[PDB]
Design a protein around this nucleic acid. Structure first.
Length: 121
RNA sequence: AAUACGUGGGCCUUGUACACACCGCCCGUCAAGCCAUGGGAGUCGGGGGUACCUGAAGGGCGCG
């Protein structure tokens, strides 16, 4: 459950550390985004000598949600943070590593290259 | 014919920042062209220090 002005951890090896959600894409008055949803972000903090600049508007895919997500088999998963991965214009990973676990729902989001993740839960 | 003869050159000394020689040299501002370098709301880095919190391996100390 991520909305406009929510702050997310950036869970890849690109320069960004924190991001701010500008917009949830997908329709008029679409309020919330969950794992596997695409959002627009503004980069809030970077590491020194970062490829991406502070204040850069970018796209991202949500990979971890504090609010729990329901699976059709009656199971639920929730994480301790809210984390996203930045994307380029083509819709591909901007970086090369993924830090922390990612949700299993990302397999079906045509986002298979996040198989860089240490563990898919 | 008239009319009074007293008010630019040479010699000696002196100063010189001139020696094409005072029709000389020469300062400073404004304007023009290149070069280097100061101040500045801020903003971006680099490694070191202090304190705190976490904390591997391997010894020590009493499965911690």
């Amino acid at each position: 459950m991520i909305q406009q002005e929510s702050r997310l951890v950036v869970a890849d090896n690109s320069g960004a550390k924190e991001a701010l959600c500008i917009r949830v894409l997908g329709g008029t008055r679409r309020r919330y985004a969950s794992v596997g949803d695409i959002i627009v972000v503004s980069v809030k903090s970077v590491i020194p000598s970062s490829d991406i600049k502070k204040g850069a508007v970018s796209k991202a895919v949500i990979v971890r949600t504090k609010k729990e997500v329901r699976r059709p088999d009656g199971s639920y998963i929730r994480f301790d943070d809210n984390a996203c991965v930045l994307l380029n214009a083509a819709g591909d990973i901007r970086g090369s590593r993924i830090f922390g676990p990612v949700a299993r729902e990302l397999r079906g989001t045509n986002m298979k290259i996040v198989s860089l993740a240490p563990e898919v839960l």
